[PDB]
Amino acid sequence: RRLVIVESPTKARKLASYLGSGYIVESSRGHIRDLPRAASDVPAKYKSQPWARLGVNVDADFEPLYIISPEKRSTVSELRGLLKDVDELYLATDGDREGEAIAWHLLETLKPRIPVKRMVFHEITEPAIRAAAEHPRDLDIDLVDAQETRRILDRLYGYEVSPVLWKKVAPKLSAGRVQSVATRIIVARERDRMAFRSAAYWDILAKLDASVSDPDAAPPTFSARLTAVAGRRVATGRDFDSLGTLRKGDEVIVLDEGSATALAAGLDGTQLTVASAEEKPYARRPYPPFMTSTLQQEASRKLRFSAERTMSIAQRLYENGYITYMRTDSTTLSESAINAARTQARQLYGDEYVAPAPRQYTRKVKNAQEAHEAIRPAGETFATPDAVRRELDGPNIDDFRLYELIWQRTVASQMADARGMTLSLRITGMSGHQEVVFSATGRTLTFPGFLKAYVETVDELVGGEADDAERRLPHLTPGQRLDIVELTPDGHATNPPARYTEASLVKALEELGIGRPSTYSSIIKTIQDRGYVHKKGSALVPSWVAFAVTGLLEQHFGRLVDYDFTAAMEDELDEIAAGNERRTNWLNNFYFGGDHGVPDSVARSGGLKKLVGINLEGIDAREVNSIKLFDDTHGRPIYVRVGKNGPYLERLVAGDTGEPTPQRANLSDSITPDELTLQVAEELFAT
Secondary structure, X not given: OEEEEEOOHHHHHHHHHHHOOOEEEEEOOOOOEEOOOOHHHOOHHHOOOOOOOOOEEOOOOOEEOOEEOHHHHHHHHHHHHHHXXXXXXXXXXXXXXXXXHHHHHHXXXXXXXXXXXXXXXXOOOHHHHHHHHHOOOOOOHHHHHHHHHHHHHHHHHHHHHHHHHHHHOOOOOOOOHHHHHHHHHHHHXXXXXXXXXXXXXXXXXXXXXXXXXXXXXXXXXXEEEEEEEOOEEEOOHHHEOOOOOEOOOOOEEOEOHHHHHHHHHOOEOEEEEEEEEEEEEEEEOOOOOEOHHHHHHHHHHHHOOOHHHHHHHHHHHHHOOOEOOOOOOOOOOOHHHHHHHHHHHHHHHOHHHEOOXXXXXXXXXXXXXXXXXXXXXXXXXXXXXXXXXXXXXXXXXXXXXXXXXXXXXXXXXXXOOEEEEEEEEEEEEEEOOEEEEEEXXXXXXXXXXXXXXXXXXXXXXXXXXXXXXXXXXXXXOOOOEEEEEEEEEEEEEOOOOOOOEHHHHHHHHHHOOOOOOOOHHHHHHHHHHOOOEEEEOOEEEEOHHHHHHHHHHHHHOHHHHOHHHHHHHHHHHHHHHOOOOOHHHHHHHHHHOOOOOOOOOOHHHOOHHHHHOOOHHHOOHHHXXXXXXXXXXXXXXXXXXXXXXXXXXXXXXXXXXXXXXXXEEEOOOOOOHHHOOHHHHHHHHHO
């Protein structure tokens, strides 16, 4: 008999069905050991060590104290009992550094005296599981070191930074390093919206008829926008800065209502002339197969799933053998998957829609031990969407809908390019003695290609045109007459920068190099649970406490929330995982200071311990929990105060017998920060 250990019961039952007689497959319920979480976790033998409760001996090369979580105590003893009756132990945790560390803890805890085989696989099928059992991988201690370094980093960061949050913001706040950076991202955007000032600008929208000079033109009518007047380009929204004043670029003319209306009046009665018309072909390549980042984005935009929901569903699909492993930065497809996807594309859409050659989407992954393939349907032959629809019906419907998304993306990635035309137009006229220029743009989809099988969804808050959208224009030739159906002077205002959705936050975490496949959703989940961020529709909105904590970190511990320093620490952890940096050297440099790392980083500034242990009696807690908004019409500053009972507005005013007396008005989450205007503040201060 052979004992096999995996992380979860679903995985345990699934591997057992494939390994057959002679294997006992059991679940570890995840991690079995952790650093001490309370004083009572410290065993008697270590109670004589003053560092035991922290769980890390920083003076002995950061030696950890791993103890068995009391909730996992019976799991360990049951595992120990089964080990006594087998001839071989198989460790079948996930192949990334998290799963490697779990296997390492199982070895350290069970101390086997029998052969050990470490199985690695990235899909759960009978071929994949059989191959893995027959070709085990040597235990990768570099992965384990990378996982352990991050665990200790997290412990030390919390140890040093938490008491500053307790003394200067609020008790029972928890420290979170990467979480505080993601929260800063959200706060920075909200601060940009509050400081945004709109500018007004006008143009003219024209509906133009071509069926007078060409009764075959299709469509007969179309719209065009005024874009130049007497050789000066007409100002648009991109021409104003965030304070509503013109950028320092080429000269423009800023039209207003009376301005634009006078141009339309001097025009109606006349006809317009096609000065120029251009056709330019385009060819769009398919989207790459999903990796974790793009799966979460598209599930969020198309399916409206939170990042956390997406990864819970993806985990069930994985453990049940429907898809490949869902924590990956690879968009590579294996040979059988490319061929299955081409076949499906051929059967569902026709030979014309299959790409002529197989399409490989190879990008360099951080660590080839940890990611082998895109997220795609499992198996040499993909399970059909209908068969999966019948199995995951009823309560498992979200599972089907994510599988369908993955299936369609995988098939579309092997399909032919989309083709169409980009269409341009210049239209001239005469409004009195001034030459006007009207511009129209278009785009056709001659051949949809892969778009027949997958079209990305535009971010709800950023907006935009879908990749399959069309704007058709009739065929025109220079000099051609056009009749003005309608002239509408049209007023506009610049808009503040859009809030993040969960989808665009994942995108920003990836592009800044701060997130990783195994952390994107837990980051986003955690900032919402700990109260830093909430959802208004699909928009992530920071809470007022998020402003207070972010300002504290920015003003006094800025290196800890710097985007570039954070991305570089993530890279260094990956270097440990590849065996190009040492766990112990990295921890010593980071915590105690050293000569290695990016210039001016925490390590190079003297280390985390010196950095946080500045003189804190010089950090005023009243200032930390005051968020300046604006002054009122009398010059008095209005500020949001974050108090034990929540947020409230406050200003100092003149009282009964002289000033300064506080005036307050309580606040709820109902009003987003950029909505609390002076007008709103004054209304709150009265009622």
